[model samples]
Target chain A: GSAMALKVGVVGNPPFVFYGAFTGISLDVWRAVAESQKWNSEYVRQNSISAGITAVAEGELDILIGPISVTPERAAIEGITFTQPYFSSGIGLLIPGTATPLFRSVGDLKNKEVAVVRDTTAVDWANFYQADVRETNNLTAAITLLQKKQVEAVMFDRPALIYYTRQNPNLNLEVTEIRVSLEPYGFVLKENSPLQKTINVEMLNLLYSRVIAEFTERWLG
Target chain B: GSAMALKVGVVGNPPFVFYGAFTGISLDVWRAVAESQKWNSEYVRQNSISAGITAVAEGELDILIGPISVTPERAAIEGITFTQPYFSSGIGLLIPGTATPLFRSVGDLKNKEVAVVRDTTAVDWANFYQADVRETNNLTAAITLLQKKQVEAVMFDRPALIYYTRQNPNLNLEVTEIRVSLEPYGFVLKENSPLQKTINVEMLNLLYSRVIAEFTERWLG
Candidate 1:
């Protein structure tokens, strides 16, 4: 109650942040920041990365954290500020372990059906391999399509696939290590936050000191 | 007149270029393309990186071959196109072998005198570190300053340092691996050169096929 109020946004993504009560690598990062800066985090939970992005860009939150990646489309918005990358992410393929003996890589899935979240960089990977693409509502729906065998493969951001697979241990799905393209995670900050430089200094310090690596091991592993 | 006049510029430097024979790793790259395409090569020697750049930009030569770095300033010229980089280089410090045993790292040169080519990227590094800077006429002069005990260390392109030490093998110097910054080598082509695309394809092939490494071993080693 005595600390400075720091408005923050969190999306409900495990290994990043969880729904209802927050805990995970992303929250741990915020906790570390709050402890050092003597700030009281006013957490505004958002359902999706896009929702968190919009809230921050509209001046609703000082910054949004989670697995939000630094992408060209988000960068072109002109109203949002992206921080230095804290983590590396990429689009990956999730397919059944039974399919492994038949396919060596995602390339083997070409001409086969694949699902991705609508209008994501994941679409780029699907199109690159000339796969018959199905647009899903979100990452979870894409995985659902895979579970039902509606599609031979699901391509989504690797961090999300890792979280989803870990949560549903029985899926017994094999995730190919083939990274289609790199997308680094960054904090989406509000324009003219005045806290830009201050936050970045701390963020860069955390990165340079390998605190981010510890966070990765504690949660992502 | 039986073959096409492939006007090419060469600056005599080594590991990149040698002498009237026009040999080095960079020259070997051009030789590979010429041998493959059955193109007759014409050599028009230039004195400096700037002169060769100007000749290619003015369409006096089809292309310039040397340790020409693809820098922002060189890219800014109106009528020049740079190929994908085929070689990596950076500014490095050349000092005595005995000096290496005395110091833990190059940062030890912070307060000491350092030499660089006047009006070059090496100057920027010296300025940033606030070293007692000695501006020489060229890379040769910078190394000369070091040899004459006018400066404790010489800062210039890594390729030139390699050349200088080889030429004066009795100088008893050590070249530190600490690169101040990168300056990758590219083939500079004139505007509207129809062969630009062809050259890059061969360059990339050579790079991927390890022909570049073979050239490096033959000349640089």
Candidate 2:
């Protein structure tokens, strides 16, 4: 029997989703699971995570899977459910890679000016850990503030810090291995979507099947 | 604030664990999780998966993390708990790449003989699916039989099939993309290890932190 096509939403996030094409770790894994369950999926392209979440909540899309932040703020606002998280990342502190005994771990951020991407997990972690936080619009601004010595460090996701350091060695910055908080990612579905159970089961099935890990090797590597 | 050391078991499984040295996606991810929670670990190396499972079950080891098949057979006896599954895979069929309309999917395995490693997930899958199965000691033997034309297909893990075909092009075989079953891998702990909660939280922490995905890219690639 031919299965009904599902409106599964996706936003082209790199590594998870790429530009102009529906390919990435997240997309590939989802495709594998959908195939296993013999479910046909029609990818509803989303411009932004915000848009996808809204569309799912309104029951326009069956599920929204992306490299998204799972926050307490979004928990209440979206009224959605998430599957078992497949990927992990956390906000890291970017400081001069060189010796700086004064600025070490998260505990050392007492009263020192620290810039974070506004309304991100970075802000939440910095504030929760009690730091004098300065809000920035994006990673570059925070990094620029740190480069100008305007702040002792810049707080952002590990990828942003790792990428910037790799691109500009003269930035003289390194992202600390320590994470302020873990940002786990999962497939999000609207409240009471019947396919939620189906998608959830197939996801666990996919996880056990290991095509997800294989896709990671293919795309990320 | 020194964390208590944990006794984690490991076996040599590529991409998951390597020989002698505790390196690979599984070990690397465990290290990241332990670091995140400020936990110290001492890896207890085991030669076999059975040994590791038994060690953890008997409380000699605190936990075991590898690309282990989570089968009902193990669950009934081990009484061990599994942290969330990380990857999914299952039994697969490797058929000749040459055009053969007679033999295609699993449905075509009516009376055709399929070779599988004895006491493996492949055997279980073949038996359950009711195929004319021939037993072999290992992948090489299974492939040897297939090459000799004694069997129509060699049933094994996707990696085994993928690697065998890549390694032996003269064999003129390719893995059928169809997965007969899904084998999910997860972190294992004793019936009620004191550190289960700690390991569970940290493992999820590692997953969400994206270091696990990073490590998967690193070791697997």
Candidate 3:
């Protein structure tokens, strides 16, 4: 049940990408699993989720891991398959304190301008809902826009928005309860790839050991 | 055409705002003109463009001057009006090198990832085209992403990109032919404000003036 070597595509952003010689929890665990399982593995680092998708679809990679979300449209795309959900979250709306018209739902943003991180799930959901969206490339920029009142509101994941708001109390921003999209992240594989079974088994083992939960809580919380 | 005193709201970012003792070109010129006209004018400085718009709309201010765009949608909004175009330019696409895929048109970026500044016209254009976009807050972050090869292309105004590329020739990035939006920047004003005519005339004079043209060429070129 072993191949001479397995090539896996890993996708993630910083502190998860082993930047400056810092091996993240996911990378450490995966390396340990590979060694214990007696499997020769080579990781090709391609951080962006879209890049991971492209690599898997183009057959340049065998499998993809990191914080990648599963979408119905993405599932329908050719040459890609996704594992069961590993993490679940949803996009949330963020607004500055000075913004008067509080957003209770997506409809509230119909005519209002919304700032979103370009190419992210937030932007995708914003477009799907047809909100007048202005896209920025990073979380800081989106927050800066909100600060400058360039856009009425900013949208991203609840965790990230909370982190930002907590850091900048002077911003006086509020996070709405409305959910934009259900983001379930999982490992990605190429269609008909034999590596799916191995990845799933490893994932289950990590879950059973409670190591996955611990890492998630430590970093995500 | 002069009252006891007219209040004008000024909203702008760095180099446009009065940093310490150095007033920007627009503010400096307006201050001199107002003094020469023997009109009592007061400049109220606000940091947020949206706040400036709101202040003008609420009739708390007679006129608003800044680097604001005169978009059709903005014109339709209540309580605010825009003057004729003061500065006109379109967002340009920048890539790592000439070898990068030529983005002559929007269709070229159907599957490519593009980086854009958050809350600006460049981001708006990226969203419209549905390109895989990454939003960064400033030129530095966007350039960092480009240098790291996180995105396939970067988008910004021609002058801004040219300045950036000149400063970082080692990056080997070039501006492409794809134009995002024709942004005509103008001053903002309250609807039915009597100062609109005077502001427009002054803006036109500045735009066509040889003094302003030489200054622009020195910095922008």
Candidate 4:
């Protein structure tokens, strides 16, 4: 006899939509989106991209805003739909400044020990493009290896490399302008969720308003 | 009553001497020394220079070796005698390859984050020379922070830096030729120990035999 309250679920990860900490640009954006929607939303913090997909498939979450790239194989999975791409990123290579014979192309890394974070898209890219790759848990470890002269170069997302270089001045590491795979990121929703349309509309408005571009420029520049 | 076995403590840090699963150069030299002298010897492994001093003061060890440098302060300490300097060493600064303003002198590191290993002679040298310094547990950690861009430079014994740099090519770090401090390494023996005379005789033989010189040239070259 009583109407059921809409319980919208959202899943995301850190440097994006970390629930506990209300800092960072991504967190602010997510908060703004939730407030504007005026929907009763539950935020779920998941560490991996697979967990985000699982939560949506099980109907436990209505949407996910983490920077997960869409793939044809992933699209074949049931109970998932993606909004228009909010951001586009690509893989990059990082090398120490003093290193001679700079890596100008992907082929240049052939037979070279490239550093990468384990279980990351960069690792996958390196496995496909480079010869030998050293994998670690995070950027810090990979960077540590790079500094220790353990590896020739490190491969990761351009955004992450830029962020690390900005934070650490003494590293004197350089990133190549060479682009690998162009990954489009978007909000993921349950396959048949009615809220998909609303989220898409909001994303369109945000894109048209140039707020996303402005935010990217401010943080990245 | 029988006198206790001559407690010969050898410095066990890698590449110098320490009992690992495999033999090291220091271990081999000490073993030869023990067998030649026909003295009952016991090996002690300690981490810091202070520990070596402590062990000798407490009469826990009759002699100590392992690249321990002699300082005036150490000489002044009661009940400690040092053999003639076996190896000559000096401190230098290692900086990222791309650091435009080459660190020319100790004064250049004023107010800069210079990495130093904790409880090593480098710590004291940094305090005496550089205005600001950050101490870490080992040479690797110091070089790691340098690679992460957390520290501008790392200051330590030239031999350690050269050893690490040779192993890690991606470090893209360079050592400044400017010497920070002169360090002369020797074996430590307890004050008034009869074994001191024999040890000194062996050390003098080691010096003239060109064995120590050859080893230093090969390793430090």
Clashing residue pairs, backbone N/CA/C < 3 A, model 3: A118-B133, A136-B135, A137-B134, A137-B135, A137-B136, A138-B135, A138-B136
Candidate 3 matches the true fold with a TM-score of 0.44
lDDT of 3 by residue, B117-192 (tens): 7656667668778888899976668878888889888887665676667767877788876666555556666654
Docking quality tier of model 1: incorrect
Model 1 DockQ, alpha carbons vs. true complex: 0.04
lDDT of 1 at B8: 89
lDDT of 1 by residue, A135-175 (tens): 99777788889999899888877777877788788879988
List each model's interface RMSD. 14.0, 8.3, 26.7, 36.7
Candidate 2 per-residue lDDT over residues B6-56, each given as its tens digit? 888886345566666677777777787677668788888876667777888
Candidate 4's C-alpha runs over 4 A off are A1-221, B1-5, B12-14, B18-25
Clashes of each: 1, 20, 7, 5
How high is each candidate's TM-score?
Answer: 0.53, 0.48, 0.44, 0.47
TM-score of chain B of each: 0.88, 0.77, 0.76, 0.88
lDDT of 2: 0.69
On DockQ, who's better, 1 or 4? 1
Largest TM-score belongs to which candidate? 1
